[PDB]
Amino acid sequence: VRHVALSVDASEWRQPVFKQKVLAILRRLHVPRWSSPLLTPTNIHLQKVSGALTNAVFFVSFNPAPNPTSPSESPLLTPTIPPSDPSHPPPLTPEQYPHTLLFRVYGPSLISRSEELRILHVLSTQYGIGPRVFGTFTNGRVEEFFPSRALTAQELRDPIISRGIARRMRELHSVDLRRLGYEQGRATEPALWICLKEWSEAAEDVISSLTALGGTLEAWVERFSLHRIREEVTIYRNFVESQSGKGNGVVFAHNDTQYGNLLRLDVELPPNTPEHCRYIVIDFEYASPNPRGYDIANHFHEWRANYHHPTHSHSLIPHFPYPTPIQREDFYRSYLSVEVDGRNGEEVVGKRKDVPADKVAALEHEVRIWSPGCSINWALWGLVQAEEQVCALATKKEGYVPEFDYLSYAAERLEMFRDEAKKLGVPL
Amino acid sequence: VRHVALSVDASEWRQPVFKQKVLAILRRLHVPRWSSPLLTPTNIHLQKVSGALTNAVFFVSFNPAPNPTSPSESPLLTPTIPPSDPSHPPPLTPEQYPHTLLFRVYGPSLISRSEELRILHVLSTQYGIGPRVFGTFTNGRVEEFFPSRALTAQELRDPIISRGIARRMRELHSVDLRRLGYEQGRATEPALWICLKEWSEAAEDVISSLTALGGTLEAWVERFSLHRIREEVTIYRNFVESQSGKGNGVVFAHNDTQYGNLLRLDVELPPNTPEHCRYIVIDFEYASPNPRGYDIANHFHEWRANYHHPTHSHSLIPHFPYPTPIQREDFYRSYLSVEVDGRNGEEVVGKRKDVPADKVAALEHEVRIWSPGCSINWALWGLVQAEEQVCALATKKEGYVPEFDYLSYAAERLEMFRDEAKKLGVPL
Ligand SMILES: [Cl-]
Ligand SMILES: [Cl-]
Ligand SMILES: [Cl-]
Ligand SMILES: [Cl-]
Ligand SMILES: [Cl-]
Ligand SMILES: [Cl-]
């Protein structure tokens, strides 16, 4: 995998130097067509993909005009081709136009990028999962963009799309964890527990600024009793491990199947290939060993929309419905109808009706047991993202309005955890 | 440009070993996606493109099914995706499916392949012309196929398509011949003359088997007086060089713009990009320095269809009409409305109406002067392809029926030459 030792400043993406540095990276990576010596940075049609939280993602597609386009924001959707100047054609004919790319810029940060790269490499070459990476640069990487778009929240409950999502996760979960570097395989410890320990310690660092001020803000931390969380994780963990239906260890989980990381491929499928195969999962930033019921339960929470992803303060929280018992069963049947022979890797697909009911009900129990974990997971993740809001609140920076209210985000998910855990049977 | 030292036997293209060797070449070339270790030769959906004469050309596209498809013949047209087996999916999801390739296998043989490669490299990197070559093997090369199809004979006279063809040739002709290795630039000797000398000497070798037998076959050679051709080339050459309107030296000519080497690109063009830009020229096997009027006159002859390309004996010779004076003028206006600044390479496109009439009429005279050359060119090329038919005739191989009647092909074009040259003014 090719590498170039150059960086971009994502905060400068609206400036010409950004296109100059992008082009330099594409040339040194020998990205085809983009490396043509006949092009210059003005040929970069640049868009920032909205809804990314941690990292900045950009579309890079071909601008045929002699003068540059202004950079704009856009959703995750195949860029429209910008107009040309008929009197000053580009130096290439259309079959040579450069293809569209995803240009990922890392923020600061789970798994490392160097380990994420090695995993992505195994996933693609041994299991046929993941994007084509043209190369990496100092703080990001460059990927092929296949024409496609993100799903909507409404599309998660479509039975055909839901069926495809269940298939793709099953395919993810059939990856041999040993090939990824986890020596213990299915007996590896769930990444959930390590995430709750690290983020609860960081959460404590963040909210100590509120406590130290006393008064109002300390009262807020006490109203939502944020210090007893460690004592509530441990009680929940002891209940889970004490369950016989907790599942057989862990699998390679995506851990973040919100609709923004689910793609509809814009492609003509082969004859007989089912409609639900045009759907795939993207963005493995959070992927790691976890119980399969955790990954699935997380997806079901994501039916409600803006579960992991926070809501902007100027928008209404979506609130789509959680899947009913039969929609979850449709999901399980689709999920379990796919078997991958571990010896040779062959995938065989069977009828959903032939899945046995004890297998379907056992998976439901797994989901039920791991589902509260997803909420405390994102709750503690929320308190960590609140570092900046807290720092402002503690300083009383005039006129500050946070882009996301992560404090409220965390309270809400913490109460989701406490409530689902109580109704599950956890003595919290 | 990557290279692998392996060969294929094009005569074995219907056999499994052919797919095995194709896959081996794609891996060693590191063709993306095709190099995936999850694929095998049964994933090669293989088609032989019809209408190739010298060399064998194959489509290589993705077969998703566990069992191989049978190899078939096909025209130059984007292969349909063959059906999959829903119970045994391919090991890749659709965004990873390998793209379609052109797999060219050379026959025996103008310019060399090693020089053709260096020229193709200059044409692509400095002028934006030509195919993306993934790599070469011992007797061929592997190219990207962009979705597209060959034109039909009927489409050559469509004013929009004709306009695009004229543009693309102008763009070809603006190439600096010095960048291609021809030190003398526009003063380089026309390749026509070297082709007529070499092929007339080979023609003589071929037809000497007919003469040596006497009787019938010698009478045939005398009926079409094939020995006085050298004396007729020289007379025609002295008339041409004596013309003041012969044009200003030579340009990089394609020399073979039959409809089979003209492509309609299947692509969504940028806004404001004119319809005729979806048309391009392919296959540079015959390209070389020649007078621009020669290349254009050759294209006009090709309006009649099956000019260069022979007709199969079981088919009727097409016989579409030659372009009228105004269709040729439409062609000249479109051709001359494009200027490429030689200093910096910028292309500017103007209105066809603003082309001056003296420039249009001067180009017509160039075409008229060089047009008989095209017929003697293909006539002598025909006598050379007749080696095998003559060898059979001279042996009286029982039941022999030639795939193409090259002897008749050559007589016909030789009389086209003699007739157009007489009506031009050549004392032949
Ligand atoms: Cl590509
Ligand atoms: Cl163009
Ligand atoms: Cl399939
Ligand atoms: Cl490609
Ligand atoms: Cl598939
Ligand atoms: Cl244009």
PDB file of N, CA, C and O and ligand atoms in Angstrom, chain A residues 31-33 99 101 132 134 144, chain B residues 32-33 99 132 134 144, ligand 1:
ATOM      1  N   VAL A  31      -2.282   7.655  -8.170  1.00  0.00           N
ATOM      2  CA  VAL A  31      -3.697   7.410  -8.466  1.00  0.00           C
ATOM      3  C   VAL A  31      -3.899   7.500  -9.979  1.00  0.00           C
ATOM      4  O   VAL A  31      -3.473   8.492 -10.608  1.00  0.00           O
ATOM      5  N   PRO A  32      -4.497   6.501 -10.629  1.00  0.00           N
ATOM      6  CA  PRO A  32      -4.615   6.561 -12.087  1.00  0.00           C
ATOM      7  C   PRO A  32      -5.486   7.730 -12.512  1.00  0.00           C
ATOM      8  O   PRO A  32      -6.440   8.094 -11.826  1.00  0.00           O
ATOM      9  N   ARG A  33      -5.118   8.319 -13.650  1.00  0.00           N
ATOM     10  CA  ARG A  33      -5.818   9.405 -14.332  1.00  0.00           C
ATOM     11  C   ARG A  33      -5.581  10.719 -13.599  1.00  0.00           C
ATOM     12  O   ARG A  33      -5.212  11.727 -14.215  1.00  0.00           O
ATOM     13  N   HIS A  99     -11.671   9.375 -12.089  1.00  0.00           N
ATOM     14  CA  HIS A  99     -12.819   8.889 -11.343  1.00  0.00           C
ATOM     15  C   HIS A  99     -12.892   9.568  -9.984  1.00  0.00           C
ATOM     16  O   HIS A  99     -11.916  10.140  -9.485  1.00  0.00           O
ATOM     17  N   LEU A 101     -13.123  10.116  -5.990  1.00  0.00           N
ATOM     18  CA  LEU A 101     -12.400   9.536  -4.869  1.00  0.00           C
ATOM     19  C   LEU A 101     -13.000  10.009  -3.559  1.00  0.00           C
ATOM     20  O   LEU A 101     -13.591  11.081  -3.474  1.00  0.00           O
ATOM     21  N   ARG A 132     -11.439  -0.012  -1.812  1.00  0.00           N
ATOM     22  CA  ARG A 132     -10.137  -0.028  -2.464  1.00  0.00           C
ATOM     23  C   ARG A 132      -9.370   1.211  -2.006  1.00  0.00           C
ATOM     24  O   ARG A 132      -9.803   2.339  -2.265  1.00  0.00           O
ATOM     25  N   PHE A 134      -6.303   3.530  -2.414  1.00  0.00           N
ATOM     26  CA  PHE A 134      -5.191   3.849  -3.317  1.00  0.00           C
ATOM     27  C   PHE A 134      -3.882   4.078  -2.569  1.00  0.00           C
ATOM     28  O   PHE A 134      -2.810   3.734  -3.087  1.00  0.00           O
ATOM     29  N   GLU A 144     -11.075   4.652  -3.472  1.00  0.00           N
ATOM     30  CA  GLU A 144     -12.028   4.659  -4.569  1.00  0.00           C
ATOM     31  C   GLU A 144     -13.417   4.961  -4.030  1.00  0.00           C
ATOM     32  O   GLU A 144     -13.785   4.490  -2.957  1.00  0.00           O
TER      33      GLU A 144
ATOM     34  N   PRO B  32      -5.966  -4.174 -11.072  1.00  0.00           N
ATOM     35  CA  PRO B  32      -6.761  -4.099  -9.844  1.00  0.00           C
ATOM     36  C   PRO B  32      -8.011  -4.953  -9.955  1.00  0.00           C
ATOM     37  O   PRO B  32      -8.594  -5.090 -11.029  1.00  0.00           O
ATOM     38  N   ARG B  33      -8.391  -5.540  -8.820  1.00  0.00           N
ATOM     39  CA  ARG B  33      -9.594  -6.344  -8.619  1.00  0.00           C
ATOM     40  C   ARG B  33      -9.413  -7.720  -9.245  1.00  0.00           C
ATOM     41  O   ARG B  33      -9.663  -8.746  -8.600  1.00  0.00           O
ATOM     42  N   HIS B  99     -13.471  -4.873 -13.318  1.00  0.00           N
ATOM     43  CA  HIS B  99     -13.959  -4.144 -14.476  1.00  0.00           C
ATOM     44  C   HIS B  99     -13.574  -4.870 -15.757  1.00  0.00           C
ATOM     45  O   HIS B  99     -12.677  -5.719 -15.783  1.00  0.00           O
ATOM     46  N   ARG B 132      -5.935   3.363 -21.634  1.00  0.00           N
ATOM     47  CA  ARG B 132      -5.137   3.068 -20.451  1.00  0.00           C
ATOM     48  C   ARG B 132      -4.617   1.638 -20.584  1.00  0.00           C
ATOM     49  O   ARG B 132      -5.410   0.692 -20.635  1.00  0.00           O
ATOM     50  N   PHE B 134      -2.857  -1.396 -18.958  1.00  0.00           N
ATOM     51  CA  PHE B 134      -2.427  -1.943 -17.665  1.00  0.00           C
ATOM     52  C   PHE B 134      -1.039  -2.572 -17.733  1.00  0.00           C
ATOM     53  O   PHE B 134      -0.283  -2.499 -16.753  1.00  0.00           O
ATOM     54  N   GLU B 144      -7.673  -1.097 -20.321  1.00  0.00           N
ATOM     55  CA  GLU B 144      -8.988  -0.768 -19.797  1.00  0.00           C
ATOM     56  C   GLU B 144      -9.989  -0.716 -20.938  1.00  0.00           C
ATOM     57  O   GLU B 144      -9.672  -0.237 -22.025  1.00  0.00           O
TER      58      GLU B 144
HETATM   59 CL    CL C   1      -9.695   2.730 -11.237  1.00  0.00          CL
END
